[PDB]
Amino acid sequence: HHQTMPSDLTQDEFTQLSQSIAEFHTYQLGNGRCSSLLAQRIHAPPETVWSVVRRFDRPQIYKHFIKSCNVSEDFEMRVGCTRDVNVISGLPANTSRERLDLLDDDRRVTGFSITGGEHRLRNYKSVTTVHRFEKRIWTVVLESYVVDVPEGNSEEDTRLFADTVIRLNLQKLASITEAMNR
Length: 182
Ligand SMILES: O=S(=O)(NCc1ccccn1)c1ccc(Br)c2ccccc12
Fold this sequence. Notes:
There is one protein chain. This protein is of the alpha+beta class. The chain has a single domain, classed as Alpha-D-Glucose-1,6-Bisphosphate, Chain A, domain 4, CATH 3.30.530. The chain is 26% helix and 31% strand. The chain has a seven-stranded antiparallel β-sheet, sandwiched between helices. The radius of gyration is 16 Å and the shape is globular. The protein starts with 10 loop residues before the first helix and ends with a helix. 4-bromo-N-(pyridin-2-ylmethyl)naphthalene-1-sulfonamide (PYV) binds next to strand 3 and helix 3. The site of 4-bromo-N-(pyridin-2-ylmethyl)naphthalene-1-sulfonamide has 15 residues, from strand 3 and helix 3. One of its GO terms (biological process) is defense response. Keywords: Abscisic acid signaling pathway, Acetylation, Cell membrane, Cytoplasm, Membrane, Nucleus, Protein phosphatase inhibitor, Receptor. Belongs to the PYR/PYL/RCAR abscisic acid intracellular receptor family. It is found in: Cytoplasm; Nucleus; Cell membrane.
């Protein structure tokens, strides 16, 4: 009977995904670090959702606020590879240099680090996992990150900021992967 946020896992989701949260979405914290975890239900099959989420060279497919994303001409999508993204004009960030940490097509886990460019999300590190759900098939996407808290900002402000980006991105991901349906 308390105030439940829409990006929080529901009880049912948590009971299905608790171990994935333990393995993939938990961070060591304390002292100028903050982290968060967001969930997005998607009425599309997990493999469709994953096929988008895994495209490290093409975040624009579903992420917002990207003027451009450039990978090298000899780009092979493997762990360690990098992308340079340019944020649309007018935001508090201009560029992000990002590195692919994780890519598991079997378990549907990917992750990246910002290493990082013109912005105030220092040492951002993020993981996204995609999961099947039944009760007739739907997907739950979990996305989390840990990131430094800028000297004169609060943890709450930092989290609100990063959460807002992730939250929109996951809405877009849901929208486009649901769009075709059948
Ligand atoms: O380059 S990004 O596409 N990184 C993906 C990303 C960045 C931050 C949080 C979640 N996900 C990006 C987009 C929009 C904003 Br506002 C950003 C602000 C700072 C750094 C990067 C930013």
